[PDB]
């Protein structure tokens, strides 16, 4: 068994779990932490190399899954029960489970216990709190306003959402950026800036420095920031995010996941290392003692880690939050919502006109299918993949390929509408090829804007 | 094969190596020495022209490498063994070998054999030596005090360094300008001026004239100065620099390097001209007979050149010295350290306060990434590059571009954190564009101070 985990993770602790797995199977478990493994993995996976199992944030596993680089796992209903139900959503791609949830990460309210022993429960309290802290040379709250990741929890509190998640599946046409809930949260954000309780230019560096110096009573940040606060000697706590209109703040949730290589011949061995060795209290502890995982998916060991109220706050916020969509369409969400917040916060646009523009940007006419890519290639063949969002509406994909700039009649085949990968063979080495995919409806037409890419073998 | 070498180099000797390469391959080798070729090369390289191979000092190859203008070479472990291990560091950029080391250059102690048949082994000897030479109408030592390049060997002797070089990689946050070793060497320098053994206003011209006239017993200078001394008729020797606190003086090392064009289709031919034709004893001799290379990287021929003790002193000092960093951050080092030495030497600042100010100047909050630049452009497209120092910390770069002064929503794409170049296409001809690069952490924020540039197509 070959395992890839990041260098910042408890890789020596994982090696102790491997030693125990070896101690009663005779199966050698080797743990590697290559540089840039998240870039490395797809380069080696389809082309017959790579590890049996990969550990990474779930926001990358989506790209791996579209290319079919990850085995569909099949854990028991009883094993699933051992883990928090929402974690299973993070590792679901195309209705299939493609990874095991390991750890959970989300933003929390970080407060200065000296300045503010009892931090506010609602966003509505903060203005008045700020005004009283000003009269004492301080501010209530500073955090990264430039990034939708940090500001989305407040915007989502009511209606706000990225893409509706209905039953194991995203509805990429249903976007909740424009709804009255999203307007209410952003309006409140903008009003904080308007009423001089916050500053529109405040970024990550300015927020962190202020809090760690003791200039501001609160910040909004993730577990990664704790180590720098520990060193600052600030008497800090970590707690649930404030409510807005009675509703919990909804941060994006990131899940450290253990996926199994599709090409691996050790799939059953990997199943058992993970299920019956790593995802136990003794498995996760050995890794946690090496380097802390934060909040974990395994209920049993999470109940123990929560003795640390910072880890408990991370879990509470995560459970009130929204799993981070790992679909390619998130990139349109980030760009449009980034612009909207900045434009509303700067006073360049009204909240209404900023989020409207973002909604129409997300839902704008696009490529169908989307994110077509070469995943691996010999000099005579290509492996290609594309996004499967519309598979229910798609009867079949029609794929064409031909030498770029040339005038030969294209070569053509079709693939069923459930499919999202394809092989192209019989090509010429060192030649540019234009690959186009058309998505056909059940009604004899293809959906607007087929997608093409160029690539040289 | 087309080769670019400077006009001051043995270009006719290199043409004889080309004749021999032609004599058993039928491959024509043409050697050109254009004016300002170091400026010329990047202008022509990315835009499809330029030579197959370029010869230049390694301090320029860093800029060529950031833009990806140089092919990664892949010599054998056995071929690498033929050359001095430290030379390979000079031609390493982003962990990759991007050139072949040819010749080596460093400062040495130049002494007058008439005045001083046995030159001092330690810096500590010089004061007493100066006082005895004064009583005879002479001084011990004169050299270029205005430039950190000339004064750094003494400052580095103990702890002093620019950027820690750990394993094929610089740590640009680890700067050794402030450490006690750097304070000790500079203090000793300042004390020489204080005790009237040297003068703070002494520059290159004043040092050279004094030594060549026979007014001073020693100078500190490089091989380039020897020709003028030969003519002065001074009975001079060239030797190892003095120690300081038992430690060797550590001069910056410059390496004449042979790089291969990334755009070249003759990469394997160039590999073999260089490896099996130029970098041999017969190859380097033919060039050396035309015009002397000084100390060379090829162990085998260097052992022969060292029969000349001046060439041997250059090599000995080089091996005790520090490879010249060819990263863009060196420019901050030069400016800050130049000021520090001058300020301490003039008595405007204490040594401690001068080097502290320089340390905080080098490590000061900056652009991330740094040195963003256009490397080549058609009227509809730009090729851009930036510094890759933080690639391990960077998850991805977010690049934006839009018409300057305009108010259109920016166009945006992202590139992986390993990358350091990008293509921007679909632009308008004769229009100003603002290009910004943001470096994202793995924690959903960008590092402080993204970098932007303007450029008209």
Chain B residue numbers with beta carbons less than 8 Å from the beta carbon of A203 are 445, 448
Q: Is the same domain home to B187 and B239?
A: yes
d(CA A116, CA B153): 54
CATH number, domain of A396, equals: 2.60.40.10
The neighbouring-strand residues paired with B415 are: B397
Residue with tokens 């770069």: B397
Give the contacts of A315 (CB within 8 A, at least 6 positions apart): A104, A295, A302, A306
Please spell the DSSP secondary structure of B17-62, one letter per residue.
HHHHHHHTT----EEE--TTHHHHHHHHHTTT-S-SEEEEEHHHHH
B-chain residue closest to A339, CA distance = B409
Cα–Cα distance list, B2 to A4, A242, B47, B264, B275 (Å): 45, 68, 16, 10, 16
Q: Is the same domain home to B264 and B412?
A: no
- Name the CA dihedral angle for B267, B270, B272, B276, rounded to a multiple of 10 degrees: -150
Give the contacts of A15 (CB within 8 A, at least 6 positions apart): A29, A31
d(CA B349, CA B362): 18
**Residue A99 has what DSSP assignment?**
S
Q: Is the same domain home to A69 and A139?
A: no
Which is nearest to B262 in space by CA: B16, B20, B41? B41
Orientation of helix B330-345 relative to helix B351-362, angle to 10°: 170
Cα–Cα distance list, A449 to A364, A366, A404, A413, A445 (Å): 12, 6, 19, 19, 12
- Residue B444 near chain A (CB below 8 Å): yes
d(CA B6, CA A284): 62
Give me the sign of the Cα torsion angle A209, A215, A221, A222: positive
Which is nearest to A36 in space by CA: B72, B391, B94, B93? B391
Which of B325, B359, B387 terminates a domain? The answer is B325
Cα–Cα distance list, B418 to B172, B263, B424 (Å): 17, 21, 18
- Name the CA dihedral angle for B257, B253, B338, B223, rounded to a multiple of 10 degrees: -90
Say whether B446 and A149 touch across the interface (CB within 8 A): no
A-chain residue closest to B408, CA distance = A339
Which of A313, A340, A370 terminates a domain? The answer is A370
Burial of residue A227 (CB within 10 Å: 0-12, 13-18, 19+) is: exposed
Q: Is the same domain home to A229 and A95?
A: no
Each residue of B124-161: b (16+ CB within 10 Å) or e?
eebbebbeebeeeebbbbbbbbbbbbbbbbbbbbbbbb
* Phi then psi dihedrals of residue A369, to 5 deg: -70, 175
**Left if phi > 0, otherwise alpha if psi is -120 to 50, otherwise beta: which for B68?**
left
Give the side-chain half-sphere CA count within 13 A for A256.
Answer: 22
Q: Is the same domain home to B268 and B238?
A: no
**Residue B426 has what DSSP assignment?**
S
d(CA B397, CA B381): 19
Chain A residue numbers with beta carbons less than 8 Å from the beta carbon of B418 are 36, 39
Orientation of helix A281-290 relative to helix A11-23, angle to 10°: 140
d(CA B387, CA B368): 8
Contact between B141 and B216 (Cβ < 8 Å): yes
Which is nearest to A257 in space by CA: A10, A62, A51, A91? A91
Each residue of A305-334: b (16+ CB within 10 Å) or e?
bbeeebbbbbbbbbbbbbbbbbbbbbebbb
Q: What angle do CA B98, B99, B101 make, to 5 degrees?
A: 145
**Left if phi > 0, otherwise alpha if psi is -120 to 50, otherwise beta: which for A384?**
beta
Report CA A143 to chain centroid distance, whole Å: 21
Which is nearest to A150 in space by CA: A332, A329, A342? A342
What residue numbers bound the domain in which A27 lies? 1-106+250-325
**Residue A83 has what DSSP assignment?**
B
Pairing status of strand B139-141 against strand B108-112: unpaired
Pairing status of strand B139-141 against strand B216-221: parallel
Chain A residue numbers with beta carbons less than 8 Å from the beta carbon of B446 are 146-147, 204
A-chain residue closest to B419, CA distance = A39
* Phi then psi dihedrals of residue A329, to 5 deg: -70, -20
Residue with tokens 């005895």: B132
Contact between B217 and B133 (Cβ < 8 Å): yes
- Name the CA dihedral angle for A413, A415, A416, A417, rounded to a multiple of 10 degrees: -110
Q: Is the same domain home to B116 and B243?
A: yes
d(CA A297, CA A300): 9
CATH number, domain of A314, equals: 3.40.190.10
Contact between B56 and B38 (Cβ < 8 Å): yes
* Phi then psi dihedrals of residue A113, to 5 deg: -65, -30
Which is nearest to B87 in space by CA: B298, B231, B234? B298
d(CA A185, CA A153): 9
Which is nearest to A438 in space by CA: A383, A364, A370, A363? A370
Contact between A34 and A51 (Cβ < 8 Å): no
Please spell the DSSP secondary structure of B89-102, one letter per residue.
HHTEETTEE-SEEE
Partner-chain residue, chosen from B412, B445, B446, that has the shortest CB–CB distance to A335: B412
First to last CA, chain B: 33
**Residue B223 has what DSSP assignment?**
G
Contact between B236 and B111 (Cβ < 8 Å): yes
Please spell the DSSP secondary structure of A250-307, one letter per residue.
--EEEEEEEEEBTT-S-HHHHHHHIIIIISSHHHHHHHHHHS---EESBHHHHHHHTT
Q: Is the same domain home to B234 and B343?
A: yes
Cα–Cα distance list, A380 to A110, A426, B40, B130 (Å): 56, 6, 39, 76
Chain A residue numbers with beta carbons less than 8 Å from the beta carbon of B416 are 39
Contact between A381 and A425 (Cβ < 8 Å): yes
d(CA B59, CA B149): 13
| Residues belonging to chain B | 457
Each residue of A396-415: b (16+ CB within 10 Å) or e?
bbbbbbbeeeeeeeeeeeeb
Each residue of A43-82: b (16+ CB within 10 Å) or e?
ebbbeeebbbbbbbbbbbbbbbbbbbbbbbbebeeeeeeb
d(CA B210, CA B225): 13
Q: Is the same domain home to A5 and A96?
A: yes
d(CA A266, CA A268): 6
Give the contacts of B266 (CB within 8 A, at least 6 positions apart): B1, B52
Which is nearest to A37 in space by CA: A75, A71, A68, A11? A11
Q: Is the same domain home to A222 and A130?
A: yes
Partner-chain residue, chosen from A35, A222, A335, that has the shortest CB–CB distance to B443: A222
Contact between A220 and A150 (Cβ < 8 Å): yes
Say whether B445 and A35 touch across the interface (CB within 8 A): no
DSSP 3-state of A451: strand
Report CA A234 to chain centroid distance, whole Å: 30
Encoding tokens for residue B197? 């053994």
DSSP 3-state of B107: coil
Resolution for the entry shown, Å: 2.3
Encoding tokens for residue B31? 């050697």
Distance from the Cα of B449 to chain A's closest Cα (Å) equals 10
DSSP 3-state of B74: coil
Residue with tokens 């407060």: A111
Which is nearest to B129 in space by CA: B229, B197, B45, B40? B197
Q: Which of residues 16-35 of A touch B (CB under 8 A)?
A: 35
Q: What angle do CA B162, B166, B170 make, to 5 degrees?
A: 50
- Residue B446 near chain A (CB below 8 Å): yes
Encoding tokens for residue A378? 């010999």
Residue with tokens 């706050």: A313
Distance from the Cα of B395 to chain A's closest Cα (Å) equals 9
d(CA B415, CA B402): 17
The neighbouring-strand residues paired with A259 are: A54
Q: Is the same domain home to B140 and B241?
A: yes
Which of B268, B302, B325 terminates a domain? The answer is B325
**Residue A8 has what DSSP assignment?**
T
Mutate to test the interface with A, among B95, B407, B443, B449 (most CBs of A within 10 A): B443
Q: Which of residues 245-304 of B touch A (CB under 8 A)?
A: none
d(CA B247, CA B240): 12
Question: Number of folded domains in chain B?
Answer: 3
Contact between B364 and B177 (Cβ < 8 Å): no
d(CA B287, CA B8): 12
Q: Dump strand ranges (E) for B196-251.
A: 216-221, 236-239
Give me the sign of the Cα torsion angle B431, B434, B437, B443: negative
DSSP 3-state of A101: strand
Q: Is the same domain home to B319 and B339?
A: no
Chain A residue numbers with beta carbons less than 8 Å from the beta carbon of B414 are 331
Encoding tokens for residue B25? 């391959």
The neighbouring-strand residues paired with B403 are: B433
d(CA B269, CA B260): 10
Give the contacts of A180 (CB within 8 A, at least 6 positions apart): A158, A159
Q: Is the same domain home to B116 and B201?
A: yes
**Residue B246 has what DSSP assignment?**
T
A-chain residue closest to B444, CA distance = A149
Contact between A349 and A357 (Cβ < 8 Å): yes
- Element at A172 (helix H, strand E): strand A170-176
Q: How many CB atoms lie within 10 A of CB A195?
A: 11
DSSP 3-state of A454: strand
């Amino acid at each position: 068994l070959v395992i890839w985990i990041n260098g910042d993770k408890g890789y020596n602790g994982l090696a102790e779990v491997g030693k125990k797995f070896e101690k009663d199977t005779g199966i050698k478990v080797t743990v590697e932490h290559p540089d840039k493994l998240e870039e490395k993995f797809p380069q080696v996976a389809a082309t017959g190399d790579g590890p049996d199992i990969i550990f990474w944030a779930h926001d990358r596993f989506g790209g791996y899954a579209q290319s079919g680089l990850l085995a569909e796992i099949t854990p028991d209903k009883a094993f699933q029960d051992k883990l928090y139900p929402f974690t299973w959503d993070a590792v679901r791609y195309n209705g299939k489970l493609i990874a095991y949830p390991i750890a959970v990460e989300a933003l929390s309210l970080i407060y200065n216990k000296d300045l503010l022993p009892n931090p506010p429960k609602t966003w509505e309290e903060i203005p008045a709190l700020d005004k009283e802290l000003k009269a004492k040379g301080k501010s209530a709250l500073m955090f990264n306003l430039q990034e939708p990741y940090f500001t989305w929890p407040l915007i989502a509190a009511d209606g706000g959402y990225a893409f509706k998640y209905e039953n194991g599946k995203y509805d990429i046409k249903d976007v909740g950026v424009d709804n009255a809930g999203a307007k209410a949260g952003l309006t409140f954000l903008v009003d904080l800036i308007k009423n001089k309780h916050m500053n529109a230019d405040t970024d990550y560096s300015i927020a962190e420095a202020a809090f760690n110096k003791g200039e501001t009573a609160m910040t909004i940040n993730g577990p990664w920031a704790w180590s720098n606060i520990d060193t600052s000697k600030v008497n800090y706590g970590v707690t649930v995010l404030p409510t807005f209109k009675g509703q919990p703040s909804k941060p994006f949730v990131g899940v450290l996941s253990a996926g199994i290589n599709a090409a691996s011949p050790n799939k059953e061995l990997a199943k058992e290392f993970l299920e019956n060795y790593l995802l136990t209290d003794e498995g996760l502890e050995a890794v946690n003692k090496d380097k802390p995982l934060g909040a974990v998916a395994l209920k049993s060991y999470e109940e123990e880690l929560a003795k640390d109220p910072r880890i408990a706050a991370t879990m509470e916020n995560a459970q009130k939050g929204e799993i981070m969509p790992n679909i390619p369409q998130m990139s349109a969400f980030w760009y449009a919502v980034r612009t909207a917040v900045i434009n509303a916060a700067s006073g360049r646009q009204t909240v209404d006109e900023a989020l409207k523009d973002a909604q129409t940007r997300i839902t704008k006419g696009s490529s169908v299918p989307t994110n077509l890519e070469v995943v691996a290639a010999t000099p005579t063949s290509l492996l290609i993949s594309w996004d499967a969002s519309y598979s229910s509406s798609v009867s079949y994909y029609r794929i064409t390929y031909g030498e770029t700039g040339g005038n030969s009649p294209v070569q053509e085949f079709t693939v069923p509408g459930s499919k999202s990968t394809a092989t192209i063979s019989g090509l010429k080495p060192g030649v540019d090829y234009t690959i186009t995919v058309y998505a056909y409806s059940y009604y004899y037409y293809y959906y607007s804007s087929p997608i093409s890419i160029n690539y040289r073998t």
